[PDB]
Design a protein around this ligand. Structure first.
Ligand SMILES: NC(=O)C1=CN([C@@H]2O[C@H](COP(=O)(O)OP(=O)(O)OC[C@H]3O[C@@H](n4cnc5c(N)ncnc54)[C@H](O)[C@@H]3O)[C@@H](O)[C@H]2O)C=CC1
Ligand SMILES: NC(=O)C1=CN([C@@H]2O[C@H](COP(=O)(O)OP(=O)(O)OC[C@H]3O[C@@H](n4cnc5c(N)ncnc54)[C@H](O)[C@@H]3O)[C@@H](O)[C@H]2O)C=CC1
Lengths: 299, 279
C-alpha cells in the first residue's frame, strides 16, 4: 500500500505506482538508520544498485513485502534473507538490454581506433597520428560469449560493420543463433579465431574467469576484449598479464570484481578503456526500467 | 622511372613499384606533404603525383595541369575506415566513453555525470551521401537510428537504396539528434554548420566532423557548446592541423583525434597498393 524509492529512478516510476493506487516516498541516498526508519510504514522498496538490501535491512523492515530492482540481477539484494521472510524480489530483465548492447558496441569501436586515448592525447596538447594507427573492423571476427538479450543485439549491430560474429551459449542452439547470424562453435575453437571477444553472461561458477591465463594463451596475439557484463567473467589478473605481455592488445571494462575498483592496475593501463558501470546509464534505459518495476508492483 | 615517397605509407607501396625531387618522374603523398604551385614548378621531370588517399586538397591541381602532370588518387581505399571512425564517434558522443575513461584514470567513479543517450529511435542527419556517408548510414541504421540527409548530386532514388531520406537542409536541422558531415571542403560547404544553422537545430544536438576542418565553423561550434545548443561534438579534423586554438579540444563535451580517419593498417595497405599499381 506504501512504497519507498531509495535510489535514482526516472520520474515515471513514482507516477505509475500512484495510478495503481499506491502512496510513494522517494528519498535518495539514505543512511542505514534513515532508511530502515523510512521503511517502517512501507510494504515496498525500489532500488537500483546504490541502496544495499542486506539481511539486516530486510529483517528490520517488518512490513516489507516486496523489493524491486530497476535493472538486471539481484546483486544489491539479499535473495536468501528475502525468501526467509516471504518477501518477493522483482527486477527488470529487459529494460536496459539495448543500452548495454549499445555501450558494448561503442567499446569495440573505441578499442579498434583508440578513441579514448586519442582524445586524452589531444587534451594533453599532443598531435600523435602514428601512435594511434588502428584497426578496420570490416572482415574481423567478433566472438560473443552469451547469446541472450544483449549478446544477440550486439551481434546484429557489429554484423553491419562486416564483422564475422561467432560465439557460444550452453542453452542457445546452433540453429537459433544462426537465425541472428551468430555461428556457434565449441569454446576451444573460438579463442584462436577471434580478433575481438565480448562477454554477455551472468556471473556463475562456469563464467567466473571464463577468460583466464589459459584461454588468453589460446587467443590470437593481439586479441581485444570487452566486458560490459559482470566483473570477474574476465579474470582480472589474467587480463593484466595478457596486456603486459601483449597477448591482449587492449581491453574495455564497464564492470569490475570490486566497484569502485581498489586495484588500479587495469584501469591505469594505457591499453585499457573503462567506464564506471554505465551499461544501463541512459535516460531511456532508466525510463524503461522505472516503468517495468512499477508495473510489477501495481499487480 | 624514379619515384619519391614523401609521407608515411604502407611498406607494400615501395615494394610494388619495384629538393629530393630533381631526378624523379613520380611523387607519392598523403595529406601531410603540400604540393603547391611553387613545388611543382621546381621538379622539371615530374610526370605524375599520386595521393595515397581520398582528397587531393593538398595538391595544386592547377599547377599540375599547367605542366602536364597527372594527378591520381585512391578514392575508395580508406572510405570504410573513415565511416567506421565516424560511427565510433557517434557512439562516443552518446555515452561519453573517452571522458569516462579519463575520469576512471583519475581514480574517480562518476556514475551520475556520464548518464547518456540511447541511439535507438534517434535521428542522424548525414550531409554528403557519397562513399562515406552511405556507409555511415547503413551501419547506424542497425542501431535503429533514422537516417536522413542531403546531397546536391545524389538522387533521392539512390539515397533511398541505402535507406536515407533526402530533405532540403532547412528541413533537416530541426529533426536531428546527431549530425555528421561527409562532404569535400568547398566554399559551399565551409561553415555548412555555422551560427545560422546551429540556431535552427534541436537544442542538444550532437555533431561529428570526420571529413575536413572548417566544414563545421569552429567559432560557431564553441558558441553552441557554451550555450548547450550543441551538447557535444567529435572532431577528427580541424581548420588548422595541429590546431593552435585549444578551446574546442579542451571543452569537456568535445571528443577528438589527430586526423585518424584513414589511419588503420588496412586502409593504408589498400591506398598504398592501389596507388603503386596505378604507377
Ligand atoms: N554493464 C551494465 O550496466 C549491464 C550488465 N548486464 C549484465 O550482462 C549480462 C548479460 O545480460 P542479458 O543478456 O540480459 O542476460 P540473458 O540472461 O538474457 O543472457 C545471458 C546468457 O548467458 C548464457 N550463459 C550462461 N553461462 C554461459 C557460459 N559459460 N558461456 C556462455 N554463455 C553462458 C546464458 O545461457 C544466457 O543465454 C548479465 O551479466 C547482466 O547482469 C545487463 C544490463 C546492463
Ligand atoms: N578524417 C579522415 O581521415 C578522412 C576524411 N575524408 C574526407 O570525407 C569527405 C567525404 O569523402 P567521400 O565520401 O569518399 O567523398 P565523395 O566524393 O564520395 O562524396 C562526397 C559528397 O559530398 C557531396 N556534397 C558536395 N557538397 C555538398 C553539400 N553542400 N552538401 C551536401 N553534400 C555535398 C557531394 O555531392 C558528394 O557526393 C571528404 O572530405 C574526404 O576528404 C575521406 C577519408 C578519411
Amino acid at each position: 500500500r506504501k512504497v519507498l524509492i531509495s535510489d535514482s529512478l526516472d520520474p515515471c516510476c513514482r507516477k505509475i505506482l500512484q495510478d495503481g493506487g499506491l502512496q510513494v516516498v522517494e528519498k535518495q541516498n539514505l543512511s542505514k538508520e534513515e532508511l530502515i526508519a523510512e521503511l517502517q510504514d512501507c510494504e515496498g522498496l525500489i532500488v537500483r544498485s546504490a541502496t544495499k538490501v542486506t539481511a539486516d535491512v530486510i529483517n528490520a523492515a517488518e512490513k516489507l513485502q516486496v523489493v524491486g530492482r530497476a535493472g538486471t540481477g539481484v546483486d544489491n539484494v539479499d535473495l536468501e534473507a528475502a525468501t526467509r521472510k516471504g518477501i518477493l524480489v522483482m527486477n527488470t530483465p529487459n529494460g536496459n538490454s539495448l543500452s548495454a548492447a549499445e555501450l558494448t558496441c561503442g567499446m569495440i569501436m573505441c578499442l579498434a581506433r583508440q578513441i579514448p586515448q586519442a582524445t586524452a592525447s589531444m587534451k594533453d596538447g599532443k598531435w600523435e597520428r602514428k601512435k594511434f594507427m588502428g584497426t578496420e573492423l570490416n572482415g574481423k571476427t567478433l566472438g560473443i560469449l552469451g547469446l541472450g538479450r544483449i549478446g544477440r543485439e550486439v551481434a546484429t549491430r557489429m554484423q553491419s560493420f562486416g564483422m564475422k560474429t561467432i560465439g557460444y551459449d550452453p542453452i542457445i542452439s546452433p540453429e537459433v543463433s544462426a537465425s541472428f547470424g551468430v555461428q556457434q562453435l565449441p569454446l576451444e575453437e573460438i579463442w584462436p579465431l577471434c580478433d575481438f571477444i565480448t562477454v554477455h553472461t551472468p556471473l556463475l561458477p562456469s563464467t567466473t574467469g571464463l577468460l583466464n591465463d589459459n584461454t588468453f594463451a589460446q587467443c590470437k596475439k593481439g586479441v581485444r576484449v570487452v566486458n560490459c557484463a559482470r566483473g570477474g567473467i574476465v579474470d582480472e589478473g589474467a587480463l593484466l598479464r595478457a596486456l603486459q605481455s601483449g597477448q591482449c592488445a587492449g581491453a574495455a571494462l564497464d564492470v569490475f570484481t570490486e566497484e569502485p575498483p581498489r586495484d588500479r592496475a587495469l584501469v591505469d593501463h594505457e591499453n585499457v578503456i573503462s567506464c564506471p558501470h554505465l551499461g544501463a546509464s541512459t535516460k531511456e534505459a532508466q525510463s524503461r526500467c522505472g516503468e517495468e518495476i512499477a508495473v510489477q508492483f501495481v499487480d
